[PDB]
Amino acid sequence: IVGGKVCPKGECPWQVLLLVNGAQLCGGTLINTIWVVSAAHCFDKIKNWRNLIAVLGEHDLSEHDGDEQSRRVAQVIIPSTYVPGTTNHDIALLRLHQPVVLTDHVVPLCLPERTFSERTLAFVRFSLVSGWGQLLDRGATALELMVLNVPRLMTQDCLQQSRSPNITEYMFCAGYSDGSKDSCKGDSGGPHATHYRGTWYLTGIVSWGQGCATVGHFGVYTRVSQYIEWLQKLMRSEPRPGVLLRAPFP
Amino acid sequence: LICVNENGGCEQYCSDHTGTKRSCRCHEGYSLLADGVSCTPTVEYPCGKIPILEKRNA
Numbered sequence: 595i596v597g598g599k600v601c602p603k604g605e606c607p608w609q610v611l612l613l614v615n616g617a618q619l620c621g622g623t624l625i626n627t628i629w630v631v632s633a634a635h636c637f638d639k640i641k642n643w644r645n646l647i648a649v650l651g652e653h654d655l656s657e658h659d660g661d662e663q664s665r666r667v668a669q670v671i672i673p674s675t676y677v678p679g680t681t682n683h684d685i686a687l688l689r690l691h692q693p694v695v696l697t698d699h700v701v702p703l704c705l706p707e708r709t710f711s712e713r714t715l716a717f718v719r720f721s722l723v724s725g726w727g728q729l730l731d732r733g734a735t736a737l738e739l740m741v742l743n744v745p746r747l748m749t750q751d752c753l754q755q756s757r758s759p760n761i762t763e764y765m766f767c768a769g770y771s772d773g774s775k776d777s778c779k780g781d782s783g784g785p786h787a788t789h790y791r792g793t794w795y796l797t798g799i800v801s802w803g804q805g806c807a808t809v810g811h812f813g814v815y816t817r818v819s820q821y822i823e824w825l826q827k828l829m830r831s832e833p834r835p836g837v838l839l840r841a842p843f844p
Numbered sequence: 845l846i847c848v849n850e851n852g853g854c855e856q857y858c859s860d861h862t863g864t865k866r867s868c869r870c871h872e873g874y875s876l877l878a879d880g881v882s883c884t885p886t887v888e889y890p891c892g893k894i895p896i897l898e899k900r901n902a
């Protein structure tokens with residue numbers, strides 16, 4: 595995260611850290627006790643799918659305070675329409691091997707109904723994006739969880755204001771064109787969370803951009819509202835052998 | 845009422861029905877109050893609420 599602030603410990607309790615062989619891979623979002631939403635592109639280069647760990651209740655990577663909960667990832671579900679190395683349909687649904695225990699430091703973000711998300715949440719201007727990604731373009735990653743309030747743009751306005759992949763209907767722009775404030779490398783997969791009448795909802799996933807905090811350009815986020823029914827169906831499905839599962843979309 | 849305007853007055857989710865009818869709903873871990881619009885938590889750790897801040901204003 596570029597130009598944000600430390601998320602006070604416990605105030606981003608749905609934030610997930612994904613690790614491969616102990617190394618920072620990506621962010622994610624807890625949406626109930628066994629399911630995590632992340633970005634499909636996080637898994638493009640995975641060799642051993644069985645070395646993937648999800649961590650909840652994380653805050654300061656330099657220490658262990660006992661609020662952390664680590665789980666093996668039993669399933670990574672990616673839509674059929676996602677093509678590795680590209681940007682469209684950038685979403686993954688992860689099944690944890692064992693549920694996390696909900697605590698003051700570990701709480702799911704609400705996955706909204708589509709209609710509610712399209713009719714109401716899509717018009718809430720500002721939303722929060724978070725992660726342990728790079729603090730600057732070509733900079734070091736954060737040891738403390740960072741968070742940034744970013745405004746959403748209508749796609750026509752994003753294209754108008756920007757100055758190379760299209761912004762499809764499965765994406766949206768948010769942030770700033772003055773190169774001060776953005777999500778960055780290592781934040782991918784993390785939440786774009788939207789507050790409405792006292793409660794927070796998942797509206798976006800940190801996905802891509804033209805570099806980080808590049809003047810003339812905005813962050814691009816996966817438009818989660820397009821995937822609600824796809825996710826809800828999968829969460830009702832039985833686990834299948836083998837970690838990676840490609841599932842038809844729609 | 846209608847769900848496209850003002851969220852139909854609902855705190856959370858909204859369904860339009862045949863006639864001048866609307867039903868509000870709440871996410872799992874919440875229940876709808878008798879006003880027909882408000883949602884109140886039914887569990888300790890409902891989705892989308894931040895315990896340390898909820899305690900801070902409780």
Ligand SMILES: [NH3+]C1CCCCC1
Binds near residue numbers: 777800806813
């Ligand atoms: N704003 C995006 C920049 C590239 C990494 C993912 C976040």
Ligand SMILES: [Ca+2]
Binds near residue numbers: 652654656659
């Ligand atoms: Ca820690």
Ligand SMILES: [Cl-]
Binds near residue numbers: 830831832
């Ligand atoms: Cl099934």
Ligand SMILES: [Cl-]
Binds near residue numbers: 643837838
């Ligand atoms: Cl496997």
